[PDB]
Nucleic acid binder design. Sequence first.
RNA 1: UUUUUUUUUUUUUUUUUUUUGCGCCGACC
Length: 49
Amino acid sequence: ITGRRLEADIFIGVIYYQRLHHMVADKMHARSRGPVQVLTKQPTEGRAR
RNA sequence: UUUUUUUUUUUUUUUUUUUUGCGCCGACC
């Protein structure tokens, strides 16, 4: 941003990095209203349902 | 030549508007 030299020598290298399956696309869940359990009349369990 | 039964009136149409449970395994914080 500033374009100035950093006051410290920054350690930089090549590191093998792995992307894991824990993605936010499969983890975001939002429920307002919907299906309920027949026995307890309470909200169901799971993002799929 | 012979006894021991009783008797009367007041309630209406062809018909109508969302898979629960059981157990197992892996994994995140």
